[PDB]
Amino acid sequence: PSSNGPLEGTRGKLKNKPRDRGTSPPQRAVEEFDDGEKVHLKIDPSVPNGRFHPRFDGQTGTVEGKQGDAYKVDIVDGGKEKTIIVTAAHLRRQE
Amino acid sequence: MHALVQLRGEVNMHTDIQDTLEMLNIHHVNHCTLVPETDAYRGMVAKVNDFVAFGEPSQETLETVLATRAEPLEGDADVDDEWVAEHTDYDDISGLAFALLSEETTLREQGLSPTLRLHPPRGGHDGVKHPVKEGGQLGKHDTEGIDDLLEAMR
Amino acid sequence: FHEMREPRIEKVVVHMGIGHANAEDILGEITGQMPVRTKAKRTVGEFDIREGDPIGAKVTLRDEMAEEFLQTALPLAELATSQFDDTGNFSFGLDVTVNLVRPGYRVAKRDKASRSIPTKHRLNPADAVAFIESTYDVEV
Amino acid sequence: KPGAMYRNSSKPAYTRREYISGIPGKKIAQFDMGNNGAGPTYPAQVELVVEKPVQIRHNALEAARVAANRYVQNSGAAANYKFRIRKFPFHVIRENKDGMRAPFGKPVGTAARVHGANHIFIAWVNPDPNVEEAWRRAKMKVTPTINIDSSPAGNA
Amino acid sequence: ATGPRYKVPMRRRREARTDYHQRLRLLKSGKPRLVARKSNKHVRAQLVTLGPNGDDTLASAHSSDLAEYGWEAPTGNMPSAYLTGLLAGLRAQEAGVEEAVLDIGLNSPTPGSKVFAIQEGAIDAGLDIPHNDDVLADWQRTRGAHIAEYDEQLEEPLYSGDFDAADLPEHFDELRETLLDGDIEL
RNA sequence: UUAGGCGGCCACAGCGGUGGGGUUGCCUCCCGUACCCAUCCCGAACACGGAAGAUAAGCCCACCAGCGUUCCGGGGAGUACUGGAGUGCGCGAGCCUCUGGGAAACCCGGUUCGCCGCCACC
RNA sequence: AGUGCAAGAGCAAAAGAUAGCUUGACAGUGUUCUUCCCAACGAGGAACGCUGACGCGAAAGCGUGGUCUAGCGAACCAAUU
RNA sequence: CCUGUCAAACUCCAAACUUACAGACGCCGUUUGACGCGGGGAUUCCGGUGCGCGGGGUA
Ligand SMILES: [Cl-]
Ligand SMILES: [Cl-]
Ligand SMILES: [Mg+2]
Ligand SMILES: [Mg+2]
Ligand SMILES: [Mg+2]
Ligand SMILES: [Mg+2]
Ligand SMILES: [Mg+2]
Ligand SMILES: [Mg+2]
Ligand SMILES: [Mg+2]
Ligand code: NA
Ligand code: NA
Ligand code: NA
Ligand code: NA
Ligand code: NA
Ligand code: NA
């Protein structure tokens, strides 16, 4: 890469298809998950806060407690265990 | 149920391919195993497709091989009708073979080694650079085509 | 059907597009209520570079305040036709514009469940001339 | 310079003028020839079909087209036919003209990428195929071997 | 509309009915919403919660079913508002609902407005709602005193036939009084 | 749901168009400014108070496909591209065979003029 | 369109405009991610909390500077609280 | 309206494929103790080739 910022190479994943443009529905930004639940991490280009480092877009971790409103999802980066602070806006229930 | 015979060595073959062959219990050239026709098994032989020979064997042929090349999970013991009868749920080789073909049981379930270490093809095979439709000995075969290979490697 | 379809005057805006005022006074008397400043946008050569800046005033008259004004304004005008809106409006003159529409307009001006008026329920240049002309004067 | 240096479609597509500057103008004079006032209302329609994907520098396009159309004056300056070269030289080509250090070249020309089987030229003629000859001279000046294909014309 | 790239607003925004930005703030509390809505002739008060396929209304009250308790006055006014709030508030209590936040939808937070009146009522019914006392009306206007005094400048009954001539903020008391003990649907 | 309130999905729901519907459950337009409140000017809006009138707007209901959209059939196409294999072909560029996947444009014909949840209600 | 500045991205009852008011560009201490994919490594950066005190708002709530990714510096020594 | 062409820094579309998690089969581990944890000792940080995909370059 020509530079090493967090958005380097994120033009694709952090953009919306023209029709999904504009403010997202609140229902999901308010979803309540329980510890133990599997959730898919995917940033919502429309929602500025509650994000995580792009690299983890695609991961499916396990909710383990929360911090403030945000949740703490455990994921495994390659072989390393990591804890990710993400808001519901960017989470989906697996299955 | 198909019969798998590895016809190509390990040198240079993708690891994930070699591993598959290993998961299907074949670790040497000319070694053969019987595999149920399932989605999961189908996907594995498709992957191993270019280094193996496979097809559905005829009852007889299976029997001949079972008789000539079957082995206990351990030891030299010949697997003959008697062995079969005194050690398995069946009464004789034919009984066993029918069970394998109909995929009702497996070589392990009956205390037999998952592997039929065949002999090199008497007369040689059709080559390992082309598939069957091309005159080679690789890929899927005819029940008659698989038999001839198995039989020559009896 | 009618009664709720027959035209009516909704606001008459009287504004003096000056270029920098003392003119408010006359607008206050000529109408009957306070005028409003007219800031401008964009910086331009007519020494009008100032963004927020008084450059005219206006007065939006409604109801009687509007008629009682038109009952002297119109007479001072002659024109008609071509000089009319596609929505049945018209401006003559110091400027004096007249906005005309039918009974259910609030539907497009309210906050909740607002909606734009359907072309059919809109006012045409013709249906307008008629309404006004039929009120102390002549068309073209 | 030689066609050898640019006849292969091995490099990335390089055409964004928004990031390329100093691109030389095309030598191709025209694309529509003959009676361009008229539309393809002709009995016979022959085409010159390139038989291999290649890159053709505007150089070759002009030389090819000229040699063909210039010849189609076996029919006359205002003859009845219409000739069309359908491809355009979009692909910008460079040259590293220091050695291999900072070798990204400088713009030196343009070329058109044609894929085997496309028709680069289409002529429209009445049963009077002098055009077939205009093309034996045209493919004479482009890298690939070519196929002279006739379309509407069972007037053999 | 125009093309494949065109962006159409969410249905409830097209209909200009829901202000989603505010709705998100509302939902934040994690508490039920006390939906305060109006109509030219009526006033509605609902207690909504969140749900898998959309909102759930656990307790509601409409200015029309107010008469069902002895209301013999118009229903698009202050006293009516308060009461409808109190009514819903109580049904709310019965439902096992203890707290909620005020959703005034697309209305304006003007002081002493009917919504706030609706809020006051629901509060008094026993419901716990984040509020601000001095944004509410001064009890008398809630009773409907501003109206009785308006009919004082009579010469012609403020009420076409209806009930009374000089109107009755007392009728208000009599009703609130009623809702505060026993009775059906509460 | 003989017209309501809050929503979910967020165009299958958009754009445009036709027909129908209200002594009342109703929603509206509508009437009107003493009050709470309100317009850098206007009770336009916002807010409050109210029913003389109206179903013309909106809204609700039934429907139209011309545009935009969703999905499906047949054709394009098992084409383009492609994971695995080859002492197959080609000066080469590159192509071909076996095996596992598999498109886009476009045409023609259907579909689509929202679906669903909770509450309230002759 | 605008949103201070590259490029890419976000945003319309707004993240833009206008008006008004305000100083959360606050003190303290952390969690996590990043810096350094995987996989050890400082400064720096961010996201998200808590404690204290505040601003605005009817209120839910928003404010841990500017919508996001650049704008930065160890030990020793000095001045400063 | 008709007609002729393009895109590494275009996208109304869109694979093969790669990839997170989960189940299933397979294989493996529970005296051959896997997965993992803690510690001792390194070597190593001139690589090269074939094939696929590349970027630069006439090569
Ligand atoms: Cl993170
Ligand atoms: Cl409302
Ligand atoms: Mg990319
Ligand atoms: Mg053994
Ligand atoms: Mg021999
Ligand atoms: Mg051979
Ligand atoms: Mg009607
Ligand atoms: Mg910020
Ligand atoms: Mg990849
Ligand atoms: Na969105
Ligand atoms: Na040099
Ligand atoms: Na040639
Ligand atoms: Na001013
Ligand atoms: Na109507
Ligand atoms: Na750090």
From Swiss-Prot, chain A:
The keyword RNA-binding applies. This is Large ribosomal subunit protein eL21. Keywords: Ribonucleoprotein, Ribosomal protein, RNA-binding, rRNA-binding. Part of the 50S ribosomal subunit. Interacts with protein L18 and binds the 5S rRNA. Has been cross-linked to L18. The gene is rpl21e. HAMAP family: Ribosomal_eL21. Disulfide bonds: none annotated. It comes from the Archaea. GO terms for cellular component: ribonucleoprotein complex; ribosome. One of its GO terms (molecular function) is structural constituent of ribosome. InterPro entries: Ribosomal_eL21, Ribosomal_eL21_arc, Ribosomal_eL21_CS, Ribosomal_eL21_sf, Translation_prot_SH3-like_sf. Pfam families: Ribosomal_L21e. It comes from Haloarcula marismortui (strain ATCC 43049 / DSM 3752 / JCM 8966 / VKM B-1809).
Swiss-Prot record, chain B:
Residues 123-144 have a biased composition (Basic and acidic residues). GO terms for cellular component: cytosolic large ribosomal subunit. Part of the 50S ribosomal subunit. Binds 5S rRNA. Belongs to the universal ribosomal protein uL30 family. This is Large ribosomal subunit protein uL30. Keywords: Ribonucleoprotein, Ribosomal protein, RNA-binding, rRNA-binding. The keyword Endoplasmic reticulum does not apply. Residues 114-146 are annotated as: Disordered. It holds the Pfam family Ribosomal_L30. InterPro entries: Ribo_uL30_ferredoxin-like_sf, Ribosomal_uL30, Ribosomal_uL30_arc, Ribosomal_uL30_CS, Ribosomal_uL30_euk_arc, Ribosomal_uL30_ferredoxin-like. One of its GO terms (biological process) is translation. One of its GO terms (molecular function) is rRNA binding. It comes from the Archaea. This is one of 5 proteins that mediate the attachment of the 5S rRNA onto the large ribosomal subunit, stabilizing the orientation of adjacent RNA domains. The gene is rpl30.
Curated annotation (Swiss-Prot), chain C:
Keywords: Ribonucleoprotein, Ribosomal protein, RNA-binding, rRNA-binding, tRNA-binding. GO terms for biological process: translation. Pfam families: Ribosomal_L5, Ribosomal_L5_C. One of its GO terms (cellular component) is ribonucleoprotein complex. GO terms for molecular function: rRNA binding; structural constituent of ribosome; tRNA binding. It comes from the Archaea. The keyword Methyltransferase does not apply. Belongs to the universal ribosomal protein uL5 family. This is 1 of 5 proteins that mediates the attachment of the 5S rRNA onto the large ribosomal subunit, stabilizing the orientation of adjacent RNA domains. Forms part of the central protuberance. Modeling places the A and P site tRNAs in close proximity to this protein; the 5S rRNA and some of its associated proteins might help stabilize positioning of ribosome-bound tRNAs. In the 70S ribosome it is thought to contact protein S13 of the 30S subunit (bridge B1b), connecting the 2 subunits; this bridge is implicated in subunit movement. NCBIfam families: PRK04219.1 (NF003258). Part of the 50S ribosomal subunit. Interacts with protein L18 and the 5S rRNA, and probably with tRNAs. Forms a bridge to the 30S subunit in the 70S ribosome. This is Large ribosomal subunit protein uL5. It comes from Haloarcula marismortui (strain ATCC 43049 / DSM 3752 / JCM 8966 / VKM B-1809).
UniProtKB/Swiss-Prot annotation, chain E:
The keyword RNA-binding applies. Pfam families: Ribosomal_L5e. Disulfide bonds: none annotated. Keywords: Ribonucleoprotein, Ribosomal protein, RNA-binding, rRNA-binding. GO terms for molecular function: 5S rRNA binding; structural constituent of ribosome. One of its GO terms (biological process) is ribosomal large subunit assembly. GO terms for cellular component: cytosolic large ribosomal subunit. The keyword Cytoplasm does not apply. CDD domains: Ribosomal_L18_L5e. It comes from the Archaea. InterPro entries: Rbsml_uL18_euk. Belongs to the universal ribosomal protein uL18 family. This is one of 5 proteins that mediate the attachment of the 5S rRNA onto the large ribosomal subunit, where it forms part of the central protuberance and stabilizes the orientation of adjacent RNA domains. PANTHER family: LARGE RIBOSOMAL SUBUNIT PROTEIN UL18, RIBOSOMAL PROTEIN L5-RELATED. Part of the 50S ribosomal subunit. Interacts with proteins L5 and L21e, and attaches the 5S rRNA to the 23S rRNA. Has been cross-linked to L21e. This is Large ribosomal subunit protein uL18. It comes from Haloarcula marismortui (strain ATCC 43049 / DSM 3752 / JCM 8966 / VKM B-1809).
